[PDB]
Write a protein that binds this DNA or RNA. Structure first.
Length: 1050
DNA sequence: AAAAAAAAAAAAAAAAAAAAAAAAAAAAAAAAAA
DNA sequence: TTTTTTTTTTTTTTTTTTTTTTTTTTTTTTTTTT
C-alpha cells in the first residue's frame, strides 16, 4: 500500500530481505515507482527489476518521478556490487536520454549518473566513452538557449558538459590519499597515457565523422570547438586545455601534405583554427608581466598554482575539477626548491584569479602552439584559393581585433599592400576590413583610394565608408582633401545607392555640419573656415574634381525638386553665411590659397542663384579700383553678380564705369573679355548710357586710320575694338559687321605676320561670339587659307579660340538642361569640328611641345563632346603613343582608354591604321633614334589585353600587321616593339617564332639568289628570333636590350 | 519550235567557342518578436 | 536581451542561349542536245 510504503520509507530515513523481495514483486507487477525508490533507498535481481521498471517508464514518457533518479546515483557511487551486465543497460538508456524545465533536470540527473558510473568502475571507461560518442549526431544545429546547460551567463551544451567532467574524473590524486616515490610515478604515467589515448581517440572519431559529411555534419564539430573556446577561460575546467590541444594539432594536420581534402573541409578547418588561434592569442595577451614558461620564474609560480587551487576549492570546488587540477601539477613538479615543494605537497596531501590562471597555461602545449597557427596563416595567404585567402584575411582581422600592435612585423604589411593592389571582391573587402578595424590605417590610404573604382559594388561602398571615416577622423589638410576628392568623384556611378550615399555624406559634412551650430559664436570661425578651405582646394588638382564640385553645388544643392522645401531653406541659409565668411576672408587677407579662395568665390557667383549682395560688391570695390591675377577673378565675380542683381546706386554704377573705362588701355587681353561684358551689364542698369557709346567711338576713330593705311598701341587698340564688337551693342550697319570688315581688311597677305595673327584670332573670337558671322563666305575662305598656308602660329590661335568656343558652348548647353523631372500633363560647333578635323589631326603630330599639346587638348575636347567620328581620329591618338614625351604619351593613353571604353568595336577595327600611322610618325620624327623608343605597342596591348577575348583579338590584329608588312626602319621599329611584348600563351609565341623563321629563311634564299637593306633586315629578324628564344600534339599542349642589339649591327 | 547536265544561290544540320543566366552555398548585417 | 526572418554581397556549380564556321541538301536558271 502507498501508506505502508511511505511509513517504511520514513522509518528507514529516521533509522539512518523480505522488504526488498516485496518491493521487487510490486515493481514487477505511481506505486511501482514509490516501491522502486524505497528499495533503492534501503539498498542482482532487485537491481535488474528496478532498472527494467525505469526503462519502461522512460520509454513510456519518451516530482513523484524524480526521487528514484536522484537516489540512483548515490547507490551507484556507494555500492560497487553491480555486475557488468546491469551497467550496460543503464549506460545505454541514460546516454539515449541525455541527448533527446523538468527535462533539463532529468538531463542533469542522467549526466550525474553517467559520471558516477564512470568514476565507480575503472574497467568501463572505453565502454561509456564509445556509448556517448555514438550519439554525436543528436547535437543541436543551432545554439538556442532552450536545450543548453549552464556553467556566469555561459551556456554549455549537455554532451560536452558531461564529457569534460567524465574525462576530468580520472582524479589520480585520490590514489595519492590512499598511499620512496616509485609507485605513484608509475600510476600517474599510466593514468596520463590512458587519458592521452582516449582524448586522441575522441578527437580522431570527431574529425572522421565530420570529414564523412562536412556540409551537413559541420555542427557536430562547429558547436564543440566553439564551446571549447567558451570554456577555456574558466580555471574550473583544466582538462579543456588538453581537449583543444590534441584537437588543434589535428587541424594543423589538415593542411599537411598527404592529407588532401575538399575545399569546404579546408575552409571550415581554417575558420575553426582561426577561432582557436584568436582565443589562445587573447589568453596570451591578457597575462602578467612575466609569463615565459618556455621549458627553461620557477620558484614563485608554485605560489600561483597554490593560490589558484585554494580559490577553486574555496568558491565552487566541484571536487572532481580540483582533483584533476591536483593531478595536473604532478607533471610540473616532477631542482632543490622544486623537490622541497613536491615533498611539502606530498606531506600536505598525506578578476585577479582569471589573470593568474592564464599564467600556468604557458608551460602547456596549447599556448606554445600559437606560432604554428601563425605560420599556417601566412602560408595560406599566398595560395590561389579565393575562399581560403578571404577566410585567412578574416582570421587575421579577428586576431588583430584583440591586439592592435600586431602590424609591427613587416610580413603582414607585405601581404596587405600586395593584396590591396590585386585581389578579388571578397579578398579586397576582407583586407579593407582588416585595415579599418586596426587603429591606424593612414599609412595605406593611397592604396585604399586606388581601389575606389572597383567593379564590385561592395568594395566601392566599403571604400567610401573608409573615406568618410578618414575625413571625420584626421585633421591633416592633404589627406582630408584627398579623401573628399575621392568622395566627390564617387558622386557619379551606375548604382543609385552609392551616389545617394555620397551626396548625403557630402551634404552632412559641408552644409549640415555648419548648420548644427546655428549661428552659435566661437565655433563658426573654425569649422566654416576649414570647410571653405576644403571647397577651395577641391577646385584644383585634376579639375575634373572641379567639374564634379560645380555639378554638386549647382544641380544638387540648389534644386528644390530634389529635396523638400523645409530641407532647402537650411541649404540656402548655410550657403549664405558661407559666402559671407568667404567674402570677409577675402577682404581681410587682401599665395596659392588666395587664388583658391578667389576661384571658390567665382564659382559661387557663377551659380544658378546669387548669394552675394551689394555689401559684398562694396567690400570688393576698394581693391577692385586699386591696381597680378586679382582683377581677373574679381572681374569674373562682378560679371556674374551683375547678371542677377539690380537696384544698384546710380553713383556707384557711374564710378564703376569710370574706373573700368579708365583702365581699359592698361589691362591686357587676359581680362578684357570679362571687363567688356561687365561694362555692358552695368550700362543697361543706368539707361541713357551714351558714355560707353562715346568710348567705343573713340576706339573706332583711333582704329580708322590703320585700316586706311592697310589699303605697341595697335595691338591693344584692335583687342579693345574686337571686345567692344563681341560684347557691346548687339543691335547703316551693325557694329560687329563693321569690325569683321576691318579685321578682314587687316588680314591680307601683304600685312605683317604678327598683326595678321592677332587679326585672325580676333576674327575667330568674334565669330565665336556671333555664330551668324560663320555663315559669311569671306571668313570661311580666310580660315581655310590659314589652315592650308603652312603657318606655324596662325593655326594655333584659331585652334585655341575654337577650344574656348567649344568649352563655352558645351557649358551653356549643359546648363540649359540639367537634372529635372518632366511631366506629360504639365550645330555650329559640330560643323566647325568636322570641317577642320583633318587639320587638327595633322597638327597633333607636330614636333613642338606647345603646338602638340594645344592640338591634343582640342582633339580630346572634341572627342569627349562627340562632334565628329572617332574613327577618323583613332589612328592619330595611336600615333601619339609613338611620341617620346612622357606627358604626351600619358594623355594619349587616357584618351585612348576613354575611346576604347566607349567604342571598342571601332577601336579594334582601326588598330591596323593606328599602328601604321604610329610607325610612320616614329620613323619620320627620329631619323636615327627611331628604334630607341619602343614603348607604344606594349601600352596599347595592355590597354586592349584586359579581356577574355581581347587577348586573342589583339594577337590576331598583330598577326595581320606582321603579315601586312611582309620600310626598313618600319620593320626595325616593329621588331623592337615586338621584342617588348608579353605573350599570354606559348602557342602564340611559337607561332610567331615559326613565322619569323619562315620569313628569315625566305629572305636567305632571296639574298643567296642575288642589297644592304635586305641583309640588314634578315639580320634584324634573326636577332629578334635569338632574343626571343633567349628570353623565355605540341601545338595543343602549348595552348595552356633589343634596341642595343639592333644598334650593334653597324 | 522540243529535251538532259552543270554554273551555281539559298536553306537547313553539325562541330565547336564563347557570352551571359539560374541556382545552391556562405558570410554579414539589419528589422521584428519572444 | 536574446532569438527569428529579411536584405545584401560574392563564390561555386550547371544551364542557357548567341555566335562562327563547316558541311550537305535543295532548288533555280543557264548551258548543252534535237
Amino acid at each position: 500500500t502507498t501508506n505502508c510504503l511511505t511509513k517504511l520509507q520514513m522509518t528507514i530515513k529516521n533509522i539512518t530481505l523480505l522488504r526488498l523481495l516485496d518491493v521487487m514483486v510490486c515493481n514487477i507487477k505511481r506505486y511501482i515507482a514509490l516501491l522502486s525508490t524505497i528499495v533503492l533507498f534501503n539498498i542482482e535481481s532487485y537491481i535488474m527489476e528496478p532498472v527494467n521498471f525505469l526503462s519502461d517508464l522512460i520509454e513510456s514518457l519518451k516530482d513523484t518521478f524524480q526521487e528514484a533518479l536522484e537516489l540512483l546515483p548515490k547507490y551507484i557511487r556507494n555500492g560497487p556490487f553491480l555486475d557488468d551486465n546491469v551497467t550496460a543497460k543503464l549506460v545505454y538508456i541514460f546516454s539515449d536520454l541525455l541527448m533527446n524545465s523538468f527535462w533539463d533536470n532529468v538531463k542533469r540527473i542522467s549526466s550525474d549518473i553517467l559520471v558516477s558510473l564512470f568514476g565507480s568502475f575503472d574497467q568501463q571507461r572505453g565502454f561509456i566513452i564509445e556509448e556517448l560518442l555514438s550519439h554525436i549526431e543528436k547535437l543541436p544545429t543551432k545554439r538556442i538557449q532552450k536545450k543548453l546547460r549552464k556553467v556566469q551567463n555561459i551556456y554549455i551544451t549537455d554532451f560536452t558538459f558531461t564529457l569534460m567532467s567524465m574525462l576530468e574524473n580520472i582524479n589520480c590524486y585520490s590514489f595519492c590519499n590512499q598511499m620512496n616515490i616509485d609507485l605513484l610515478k608509475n600510476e600517474y604515467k599510466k593514468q596520463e597515457e590512458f587519458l592521452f589515448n582516449i582524448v586522441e581517440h575522441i578527437n580522431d572519431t570527431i574529425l572522421e565523422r565530420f570529414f564523412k559529411n562536412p556540409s551537413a555534419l559541420r555542427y557536430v564539430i562547429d558547436n564543440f570547438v566553439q564551446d571549447l573556446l567558451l570554456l577555456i577561460s574558466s580555471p574550473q575546467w583544466p582538462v579543456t586545455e588538453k581537449i583543444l590541444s590534441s584537437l588543434l594539432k589535428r587541424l594543423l594536420s589538415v593542411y599537411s601534405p598527404s592529407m588532401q581534402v575538399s575545399a569546404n573541409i579546408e575552409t571550415i578547418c581554417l575558420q575553426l583554427i582561426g577561432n582557436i588561434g584568436s582565443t589562445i592569442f587573447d589568453i596570451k595577451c591578457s597575462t602578467r608581466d612575466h609569463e615565459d614558461n618556455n621549458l627553461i620564474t620557477l620558484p614563485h609560480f608554485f605560489k600561483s598554482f597554490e593560490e589558484c587551487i585554494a580559490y577553486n576549492e574555496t568558491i565552487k570546488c566541484r571536487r572532481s575539477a580540483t582533483r584533476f587540477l591536483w593531478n595536473l601539477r604532478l607533471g610540473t613538479i616532477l631542482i632543490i626548491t622544486v623537490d622541497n615543494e613536491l615533498k611539502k605537497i606530498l606531506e600536505q596531501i598525506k578578476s585577479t584569479i582569471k589573470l593568474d590562471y592564464f599564467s600556468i597555461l604557458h608551460a602547456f602545449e596549447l599556448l606554445n602552439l600559437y606560432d604554428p597557427y601563425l605560420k599556417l596563416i601566412l602560408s595560406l595567404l599566398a595560395k590561389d584559393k579565393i575562399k581560403l585567402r578571404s577566410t585567412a584575411i578574416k582570421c587575421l582581422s579577428m586576431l588583430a581585433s584583440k591586439d592592435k600592435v600586431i602590424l609591427s612585423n613587416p610580413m603582414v604589411k607585405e601581404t596587405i599592400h600586395r593584396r590591396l593592389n590585386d585581389s578579388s571582391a571578397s579578398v579586397k573587402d576582407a583586407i579593407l576590413d582588416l585595415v579599418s578595424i586596426n587603429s591606424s590605417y593612414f599609412e595605406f590610404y593611397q592604396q585604399i583610394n586606388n581601389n575606389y573604382n572597383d567593379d564590385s559594388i561592395m568594395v566601392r561602398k566599403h571604400v567610401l565608408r573608409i573615406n568618410e571615416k578618414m575625413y571625420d577622423e584626421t585633421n591633416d589638410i592633404v589627406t582630408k582633401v584627398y579623401v573628399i576628392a575621392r568622395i566627390l568623384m564617387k558622386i557619379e556611378d551606375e548604382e543609385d545607392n552609392i551616389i545617394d550615399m555620397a551626396r548625403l555624406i557630402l551634404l552632412n559634412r559641408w552644409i549640415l555640419k555648419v548648420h548644427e551650430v546655428l549661428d552659435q559664436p566661437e565655433k563658426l570661425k573654425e569649422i566654416s573656415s576649414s570647410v571653405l578651405l576644403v571647397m577651395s582646394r577641391v577646385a584644383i588638382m585634376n579639375e575634373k574634381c572641379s567639374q564634379l564640385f560645380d555639378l554638386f553645388l549647382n544641380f544638387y544643392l540648389l534644386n528644390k525638386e530634389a529635396h523638400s522645401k523645409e530641407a532647402y531653406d537650411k541649404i540656402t541659409h548655410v550657403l549664405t553665411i558661407l559666402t559671407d565668411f568667404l567674402v570677409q576672408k577675402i577682404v581681410e587677407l587682401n599665395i596659392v590659397d588666395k587664388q583658391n579662395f578667389l576661384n571658390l568665390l567665382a564659382k559661387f557667383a557663377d551659380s544658378t542663384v546669387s548669394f552675394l549682395t551689394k555689401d559684398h560688391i562694396t567690400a570688393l570695390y576698394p581693391y577692385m579700383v586699386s591696381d597680378s591675377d586679382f582683377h581677373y577673378y574679381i572681374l569674373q565675380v562682378f560679371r556674374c553678380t551683375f547678371e542677377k542683381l539690380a537696384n544698384f546706386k546710380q553713383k556707384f554704377l557711374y564710378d564703376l564705369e569710370t574706373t573700368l573705362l579708365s583702365r581699359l588701355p592698361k589691362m591686357n587681353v587676359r581680362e578684357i573679355d570679362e571687363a567688356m561684358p561687365l561694362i555692358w551689364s552695368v550700362a543697361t542698369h543706368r539707361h541713357d548710357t551714351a558714355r560707353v557709346a562715346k568710348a567705343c567711338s573713340s576706339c573706332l576713330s583711333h582704329l580708322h586710320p590703320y585700316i586706311n593705311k592697310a589699303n605697341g598701341k595697335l595691338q591693344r587698340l584692335i583687342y579693345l575694338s574686337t571686345g567692344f564688337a563681341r560684347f557691346c551693342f548687339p543691335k547703316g550697319e551693325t557694329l560687329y559687321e563693321h569690325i569683321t570688315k576691318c579685321l578682314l581688311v587687316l588680314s591680307k597677305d601683304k600685312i605683317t605676320h604678327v598683326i595678321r595673327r592677332v587679326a585672325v584670332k580676333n576674327l575667330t573670337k568674334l565669330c565665336g561670339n556671333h555664330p551668324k558671322l560663320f555663315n559669311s563666305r569671306h571668313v570661311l575662305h580666310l580660315l581655310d587659307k590659314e589652315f592650308q598656308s603652312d603657318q606655324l602660329d596662325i593655326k594655333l590661335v584659331i585652334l585655341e579660340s575654337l577650344y574656348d568656343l567649344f568649352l563655352l558652348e558645351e557649358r551653356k548647353s549643359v546648363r540649359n538642361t540639367g537634372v529635372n523631372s518632366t511631366l506629360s500633363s504639365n550645330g555650329v560647333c559640330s560643323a566647325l569640328a568636322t570641317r577642320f578635323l583633318d587639320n587638327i589631326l595633322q597638327l597633333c603630330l607636330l614636333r613642338d611641345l606647345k603646338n602638340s599639346l594645344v592640338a591634343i587638348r582640342l582633339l580630346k575636347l572634341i572627342l569627349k563632346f562627340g562632334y565628329t567620328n572617332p574613327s577618323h581620329s583613332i589612328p592619330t591618338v595611336i600615333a601619339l603613343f609613338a611620341s617620346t614625351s612622357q606627358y604626351i604619351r600619358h594623355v594619349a593613353y587616357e584618351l585612348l582608354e576613354d575611346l576604347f571604353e566607349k567604342y571598342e568595336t571601332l577601336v579594334f577595327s582601326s588598330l591596323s591604321r593606328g599602328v601604321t600611322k604610329a610607325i610612320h610618325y616614329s620613323i619620320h620624327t627620329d631619323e636615327k633614334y627611331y628604334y630607341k623608343h619602343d614603348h607604344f605597342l606594349s601600352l596599347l596591348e595592355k590597354l586592349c589585353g584586359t579581356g577574355k577575348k581581347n587577348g586573342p583579338k589583339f594577337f590576331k590584329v598583330l598577326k595581320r600587321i606582321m603579315q601586312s608588312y611582309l620600310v626598313q626602319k618600319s620593320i626595325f621599329v616593329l621588331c623592337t616593339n615586338i621584342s617588348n611584348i608579353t605573350f599570354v600563351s606559348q602557342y602564340d609565341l611559337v607561332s610567331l617564332l615559326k613565322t619569323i623563321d619562315l620569313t628569315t629563311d625566305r629572305l636567305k634564299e632571296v639574298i643567296m639568289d642575288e642589297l644592304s637593306g635586305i641583309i640588314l633586315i634578315q639580320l634584324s629578324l634573326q636577332d629578334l628570333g635569338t632574343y626571343l628564344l633567349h628570353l623565355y600534339e605540341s601545338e595543343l599542349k602549348n595552348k595552356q636590350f633589343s634596341a642595343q642589339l639592333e644598334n650593334i649591327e653597324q
